[PDB]
Amino acid sequence: AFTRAFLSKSTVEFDNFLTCPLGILFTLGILLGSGGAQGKTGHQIGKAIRLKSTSSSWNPFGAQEEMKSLYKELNDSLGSEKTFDKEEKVVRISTGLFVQRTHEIETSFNESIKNDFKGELIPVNFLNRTSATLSINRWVDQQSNGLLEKFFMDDIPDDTGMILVNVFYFRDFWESPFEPHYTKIENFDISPNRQIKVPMMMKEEVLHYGKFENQGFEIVSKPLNNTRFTFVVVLPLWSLTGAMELLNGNKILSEYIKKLKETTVSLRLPKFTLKNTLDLVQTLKSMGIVDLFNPVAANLSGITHDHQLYVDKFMQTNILKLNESGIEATVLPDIDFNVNHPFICFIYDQQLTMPIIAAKVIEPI
């Protein structure tokens, strides 16, 4: 499927990885759905999303409406999820199309991104590359409510090309938070040679466990306050590559989630924060979208019909900060589950059954 294709060509890029293939879809749903990407260009997108209408033949009108409802379907769902003592959105997704101001955008394309998607068109001047970058930095700093300030893009396109940015943010409490009285400082076996300290978080409770001496990666799942989403940690029994097979899409996660039984667990978990800016232009080509990031052969006539443009940079930026209290929020055990060497964690969806956020941690920040 899509999420299983993305993690394939995204994880081969590695060191501390952090990606959210959930919203990257959203970034690109806003290309097909609105009607921006026509021809070969947008067809290659529908195909990579593996949707019905692209299965048989190019049919422009058709794949727009099916992406528009597919997006809108998943989009109110992650929005229908509200957590606290004032109700707050649990999932947070902004998606930004930064474009040369001079271009007469089609009023249909502009009508759709506003009333059809939750996303935002930003008209800026790339000639003023200096003033151009800060516009982006102010945009992302305004969307992440300060969590992701200091995002500075090293290079800018020469007038025709575009820049997309996607900011996923997942905020929630634990279902059973950690006592800070027991968050002590402990070693973390990075390698034989380097070992660092970190604030380990010790709690014992009933959590769904799973050992797989089959592959070599034991599994734990801690649910958040909103029980639909679970936080999953994958520990090797230091094999390391045995776990990644889950991370690059060779192994379905749910497939493994399903064998997790109620257990008592002595959980010791590092306090850490993961932030990780990524470019998906060399990823979305190897995954079958190569006619979009190319100036000669990109067809974004749905946006403008006076000057030809393409996508220069497809940027993503994420923040995962774990605390005793939850994620971004401030009993006799039968299983020990100490996490002091590198691991692979997920924010798993229990309804959509997909890992919205899949991360590989080498050294905890």
Author numbering: 21 to 34, 37 to 106, 109 to 261, 264 to 356, 369 to 403
What does the original paper state about this entry?
Serpins are proteins distributed among all kingdoms of life that act mostly as Serine protease inhibitors, but also as inhibitors of other classes of proteases, although some that lack inhibitory activity can serve as chaperones or storage proteins. Serpins from parasites are interesting immunodiagnostic targets, due to their presence at the parasite-host interface, where they are crucial for the adaptation and survival of the parasite to the host environment by modulating inflammatory response. Among these, SmSPI is able to weakly inhibit chymotrypsin and is expressed mostly in the parasite’s head gland, confirming its localization in the parasite-host interface, thus its potential as a diagnostic target.
In this context, we present the 3.22 Å resolution crystal structure of the S. mansoni circulating antigen SmSPI together with flanking immune sera recognition tests using sera from affected patients. One protein molecule was found in the crystal asymmetric unit, with an estimated solvent content of 67 % (Matthew’s coefficient = 3.78 Å3/Da). The SmSPI structure presents the fold and topology of a canonical Serpin composed of 3 β-sheets (named βA, βB, βC, assigned according to the conventional Serpin nomenclature) and 10 α-helices. Electron density was well defined for the main chain atoms except for some flexible, loop regions. The major region with no electron density is the Reactive Centre Loop (RCL; residues 357 to 368), which is highly flexible and solvent exposed; its function is indeed to act as a bait for the target protease to exert the Serpin inhibitory activity. Other poor electron density regions were for several solvent exposed loops (AA 35–36, 107–108, 262–263), in accordance with other deposited Serpin structures. Three SmSPI epitopes were identified: Ep1: 123-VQRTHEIETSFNE-135; Ep2: 175-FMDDIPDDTG-185; Ep3: 320-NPVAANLSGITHDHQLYVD-338. All three identified epitopes are clustered together in the same region of the protein. SmSPI showed to be able to bind human IgG in sera from people affected by Schistosomiasis, while the response of the protein to healthy serum resulted to be significantly lower (p < 0.001).
